[PDB]
Design a protein around this nucleic acid. Sequence first.
RNA 1: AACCGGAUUAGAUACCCGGGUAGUCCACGCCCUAAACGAUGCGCGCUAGGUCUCUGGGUCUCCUGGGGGCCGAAGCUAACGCGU
RNA 2: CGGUAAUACGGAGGGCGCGAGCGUUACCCGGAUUCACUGGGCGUAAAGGGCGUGUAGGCGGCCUGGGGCGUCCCAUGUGAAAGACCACGGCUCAACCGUGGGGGAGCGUGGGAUACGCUCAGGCUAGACGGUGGGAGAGGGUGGUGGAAUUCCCGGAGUAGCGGUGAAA
Lengths: 138, 234
Amino acid sequence: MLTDPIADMLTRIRNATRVYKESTDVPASRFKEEILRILAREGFIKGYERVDVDGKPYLRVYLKYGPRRQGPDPRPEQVIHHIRRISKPGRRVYVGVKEIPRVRRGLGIAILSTSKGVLTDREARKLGVGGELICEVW
Amino acid sequence: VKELLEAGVHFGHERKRWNPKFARYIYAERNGIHIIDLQKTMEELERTFRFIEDLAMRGGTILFVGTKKQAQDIVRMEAERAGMPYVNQRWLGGMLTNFKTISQRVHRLEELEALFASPEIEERPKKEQVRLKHELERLQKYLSGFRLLKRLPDAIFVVDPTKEAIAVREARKLFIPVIALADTDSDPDLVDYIIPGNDDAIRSIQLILSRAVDLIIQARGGVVEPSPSYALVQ
RNA sequence: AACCGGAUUAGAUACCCGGGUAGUCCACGCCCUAAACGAUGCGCGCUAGGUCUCUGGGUCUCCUGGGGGCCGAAGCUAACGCGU
RNA sequence: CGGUAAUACGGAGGGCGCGAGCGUUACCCGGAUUCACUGGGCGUAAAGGGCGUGUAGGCGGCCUGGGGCGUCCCAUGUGAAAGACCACGGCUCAACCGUGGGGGAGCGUGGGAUACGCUCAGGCUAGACGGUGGGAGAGGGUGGUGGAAUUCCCGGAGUAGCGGUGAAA
Ligand SMILES: [Mg+2]
Ligand SMILES: [Mg+2]
Ligand SMILES: [Mg+2]
Ligand SMILES: [Mg+2]
Ligand SMILES: [Mg+2]
């Protein structure tokens, strides 16, 4: 049926970015929109925007890459190196402010859903809340 | 005088022998053939001839490589209509990467120049006056434009890049930029500077490859005529 | 199959030859195993292409489905390979 | 390791390591991400059930609203002493000892958040199912029927072998 929408998305982005595509549709939800803002705000993507495709709501996603590169294999470095579900339908992961992960001594995100709303780790830490630990990007 | 001379007989090439990486530089598949977008040839051309002009005016060295049917001869002309090195018959294994070694061929070819002009112009146990004088045929036939190259080149300019990808391979291996005329045969992403065109039409190969050799001297004055290149253009 | 003979062989409870019961076939009822093999559980979403082919549909060079093959981007794999 | 040149056995000299000890055996955690929550795997290495149907169970699309069980936050209670930890003392040092400090999950209680998961109410149509029209097929069950071949029986004609093997019987 489509068991995890959030993961599907996290993956559509993993997959597209690895053949250096410019854009990617994902079928649209509010919670999906949210994660994308944090993604955009921390400059892992250029951004997103709604659309309609065959009568139906998608969110186009504008990926972003490094500069073309030197020697044999000139493929760019990649702005999103690592994106990964953590809470999952078959095993939900919840953490309190005291146990929030510090992805990659600082250089990394951990998107994280709380009662104050969807938030990065430092956001959440400073707001002092924890929650369902959605995923991590670096 | 470009623009119209491009769509002369030099625009679109092959069909379904294609690389999808080349999808951006195509106008359309009409008639079952691929017809390549000219506007984007021009765009790519400036960016390419800029690289060329600058390398030249800083007094560089572009190594030319065309070993295919229709390039073969127009290359040894425009190479020397520019005093630049070329490879023409056979790209050898490590011209760039075993360079120091492939170079002791040139080293020892013109050690024979020093016995075609010698007190040995008519003597030496006379079955060496072929063995040697016929060894200088291999050396002749191949190291014609490679003999002038004395330190690794500054660019390389390829005619068909998929045809000649064992060169390109080594270029990148040494960070030597790669300028190529490319078409739908080919994979852009490892051409450093791209002339998206027809790899095949002799009209095309000529139109382009020569006009690049305007620049190479017109970055130093004394530009010549329409130049010796219409081999049997018909 | 078994078995009864003819051979061959150092022997030949075998391979080769001549016969031959159960069985192989049909009805009904049991057994429930296999290199029961794609040695690859089922479902869904995503990620270049080329080529051959079965069956649909369209505006029928070809396009759009559903199946069957090979080659192979990215990636994967100890490797061999797998690769819409 | 040892079969006449043994740094591997036994003694010598010498050397290395610990030292009032040094070795040995047993048992525990370790290294062992070798039961893999952190942290593993299954085409050919150990490993996909012979196939379906579907019971319980696990899991569950887009939008809105109510509840606040999951989840998060703040207070507060509990969390004995000893131990562990950081200090500062006392036996000439230390071992030992003492004084003081600092923490903590888990659980009760009061208050709060509602993004996610749950639940309740209502909505959508991209999942699933149905309608209509059309298609290919050695998919299954029942009855029936057709021709080529072998074997047997009757008839004609007809004669000395046939069959079988590597060769034969
Ligand atoms: Mg028999
Ligand atoms: Mg363990
Ligand atoms: Mg199976
Ligand atoms: Mg089922
Ligand atoms: Mg003291």
